[PDB]
């Protein structure tokens with residue numbers, strides 16, 4: 001199966017409006033096209049146009065991303081496949097907005113209902129909605145690690161010091177897999193446990209940002225949720241499934257400070273060019289993503305872009321990068 005690639009353009013922000021920014025991006029959700037105006041003052045007609053698996057314009061809301069992209073992927077996780085979604089694009093374009101989301105200010109909504117909530121919390125909410133006493137015995141475990149300068153931090157660890165480091169090893173049980181030694185995996189017994197877990201993770205990240213330069217823009221964030229499902233149907237026979245979903249928020253594409261982003265590009269180039277050796281081992285991120293990139297996990301990429309003329313070169317870089325990645329084949333479960 002080819003990696004599926006979608007584009008999400010964010011709306012203008014107040015500073016862009018204040019600077020009287022013009023748009024250089026047109027999205028056509030129906031034709032699944034994004035068309036970028038490239039000639040500035042000089043050449044009013046030149047464009048580059050790309051077709052993707054889906055295209056989300058500035059008016060797309062969090063709930064539309066969920067319904068279109070995540071729901072189908074989560075149903076596949078529930079069938080016991082492994083899936084990955086990662087966000088790629090320049091700092092400021094909405095990777096974290098998309099993957100995690102934000103809380104609406106002054107208290108207006110519950111987390112399960114917040115319209116600014118992104119992929120991670122909606123996914124956790126749906127896992128419990130879908131599975132709960134609906135016949136299956138099931139458990140859910142989460143982990144959240146971040147890669148910065150090729151060091152690995154555990155945002156969910158009971159340790160009060162976020163700087164305490166994890167270590168990665170090959171997994172002798174699983175050919176393309178790693179063991180993250182020290183990684184706290186929290187059993188989430190029900191939906192009413194979700195928020196406090198995410199909240200404490202976010203507070204550890206805020207600390208991390210005070211400790212390390214340009215932390216949030218240089219970091220890669222790797223949230224994983226594993227679902228163990230058990231069934232005893234018609235004979236009394238017992239049929240076990242395990243689904244895993246990785247939700248990944250990459251370093252800003254404008255970027256050992258950068259080894260993982262660099263190596264991901266070299267890995268994607270190797271896969272599309274079909275070159276014989278693919279350098280997964282040369283970074284922490286690509287070791288973590290090995291199975292998602294030419295392996296047995298179903299992968300989707302959300303490429304995030306700004307609409308503003310100012311960001312022309314990086315917007316074009318992001319679209320070219322993401323477009324070629326459609327050519328990568330995985331073979332799920």
Ligand SMILES: Nc1ncnc2c1ncn2[C@@H]1O[C@H](COP(=O)(O)OP(=O)(O)O)[C@@H](O)[C@H]1O
Pocket residue numbers: 009010011013060089090091092093094095096097098102304
């Ligand atoms: N689709 C969107 N709709 C509304 N605001 C958005 C959207 N995407 C991003 N933003 C806003 O733009 C700013 C940067 O988003 P952020 O998620 O921090 O980007 P990144 O993680 O790619 O650096 C934030 O203020 C965020 O609320």
Ligand SMILES: N[C@@H](CSC(c1ccccc1)(c1ccccc1)c1ccccc1)C(=O)O
Pocket residue numbers: 096097099100101102103104111112114116117118120121195198199201202205
């Ligand atoms: N993106 C925000 C956190 S948004 C987030 C969240 C979502 C996924 C993982 C961790 C936190 C949140 C913010 C603040 C307190 C708790 C949780 C969130 C936003 C909306 C609904 C549910 C969770 C940040 O970088 O701090």
Ligand SMILES: [Mg+2]
Pocket residue numbers: 095096097216217249
């Ligand atoms: Mg971010």
